Design a protein around this ligand. Structure first.
Ligand SMILES: [Cl-]
Length: 466
């Protein structure tokens, strides 16, 4: 019998009917270059890793119209992946869109939580696994599941939907300094000043699939970051314990470490459990108990189905391999990502995915998925992400912004983002004018041609300034 408290992380699931069968869908959002919520499916986890990291929300506040949630309370839900708040938007006949926004002033980001049956009443504690009803303070509409364009989406409507709150992590009970599921980290041979990583971004996607240990500067770059993802939905943000199975997702490429018997990163669609499940071991011989400490624990990675140890091949850069014995100095030292670099790494991966789409759509025009709107909003968010701190800020706020900015520029540059922006610009410069682009790509494309180009130049300037 457990209760929800503020600083708890949850996923919000509703039941939908797909292929004539009941399935649980998680509320999700991305937030980078798109604000609208969508639904993420949790099925076939034995063959395809669910993507919990976009579904995960933190119960930031809970107030009467760490504190225990009560029925009738208004709550503020921070999306973990982006840092923005779930809200009832003022766009969409009588439904509003639901999505993320930065600003929590006003009522739009607040939701009152209500019993699904007479089994609960106003002012009682909300239990883990009670079905909730959520109502928008600003619009009086329910957070709602709707069926539209042969597809399920989330809106705010005057029809109810029941949401289950699955507990993920309970921030009030995370031991600080310990490995928790969903964490973004680096895996180091401390004595060697080396970390687990993949080839740099001057290599093509295929080459980027191979895994090795590398010393020097890469230990502060995006491509050494991995997210540890447990096999569970409920309590997927618990303390990680020795021998507990997980997957390791490479943040920069979005791919999953897998055993073929070579090591190779795989698309989520090929990332089955026998081939991708690993565990930490302390030797080679609810939240639950905290057991693996950042910095201090020496960790050995084992492939679960084979029992083989993740190790290195001595140079006769050390390739990463699996072997039944490995090396006496295999032991991995774990280091937790800062929130800044982790977010920048993710932002880079969405940008590269979206801009590659845009480039392919441009190439297909000259020989369609051409996401003009998302590219427009991506670029405005990226320009905001590189905004110089306003001269009116306090000293410490300014210094802090400037340090973050240098880190953001460095991570972007090292992933090749300057060349990517330059390729977008070259593809757009093939057109003589906005009207010429419109003739080929449509009126809406033509009316964003100049604005997209100006934002790409502005972004480029931000990527190299002092
Ligand atoms: Cl990720």
């Amino acid at each position: 019998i457990q209760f929800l408290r503020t600083d708890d992380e949850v996923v919000l699931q509703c039941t939908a009917t797909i292929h004539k069968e009941q399935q649980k869908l998680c509320l999700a959002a991305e937030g980078f270059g798109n604000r609208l919520c969508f639904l993420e499916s949790t099925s076939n986890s034995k063959n395809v890793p669910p993507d919990l990291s976009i579904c995960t929300f933190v119960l930031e506040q809970s107030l009467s119209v760490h504190r225990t949630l009560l029925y009738g309370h208004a709550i503020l839900l921070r999306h973990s992946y982006s840092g923005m708040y779930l809200c009832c938007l003022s766009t969409s006949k009588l439904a509003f869109d639901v999505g993320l926004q930065e600003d929590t002033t006003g009522e739009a980001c607040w939701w009152t939580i209500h019993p699904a049956s007479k089994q609960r009443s106003e002012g009682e504690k909300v239990r883990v696994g009670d079905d909730l009803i959520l109502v928008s303070v600003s619009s009086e509409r329910y957070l709602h599941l709707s069926y539209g364009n042969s597809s399920w989406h989330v809106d705010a409507a005057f029809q109810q939907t029941l949401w289950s709150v699955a507990p993920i992590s309970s921030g009030s009970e995370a031991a600080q300094g310990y490995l928790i599921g969903g964490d973004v980290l680096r895996l180091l041979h401390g004595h060697m000043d080396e970390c687990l990583t993949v080839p740099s971004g001057e290599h093509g996607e295929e080459q980027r699939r191979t895994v090795h240990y590398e010393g020097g500067a890469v230990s502060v770059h995006a491509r050494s970051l991995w997210r540890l993802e447990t096999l569970r939905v409920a309590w997927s943000g618990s303390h990680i314990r020795w021998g507990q199975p997980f997957r390791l997702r490479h943040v920069t490429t979005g791919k999953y470490l897998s055993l073929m018997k070579n090591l190779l990163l795989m698309d989520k669609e090929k990332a089955d459990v026998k081939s991708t499940a690993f565990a930490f071991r302390s030797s080679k011989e609810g939240m639950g108990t905290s057991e693996i400490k950042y910095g201090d624990s020496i960790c050995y990675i084992q492939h679960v189905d084979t029992g083989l140890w993740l190790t290195y091949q001595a140079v006769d850069q050390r390739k990463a391999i699996m072997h039944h014995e490995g090396h006496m100095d295999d032991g991995l030292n774990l280091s937790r990502s800062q929130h800044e670099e982790s977010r920048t790494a993710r932002v880079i991966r969405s940008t590269v995915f979206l801009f590659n789409r845009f480039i392919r759509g441009l190439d297909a025009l000259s020989k369609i998925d051409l996401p003009i709107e998302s590219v427009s909003l991506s670029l405005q968010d990226l320009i905001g992400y590189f905004h110089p701190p306003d001269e009116h800020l306090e000293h410490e706020d300014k210094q802090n912004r400037l340090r973050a900015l240098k880190n953001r520029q460095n991570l972007f540059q090292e992933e090749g983002m300057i060349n990517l922006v330059l390729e977008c610009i070259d593809r757009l410069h093939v057109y003589s004018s906005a009207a010429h682009f419109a003739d080929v790509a449509g009126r809406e494309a033509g009316e964003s041609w100049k604005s997209i180009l100006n934002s790409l130049y502005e972004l480029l300037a931000a990527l190299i300034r002092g």
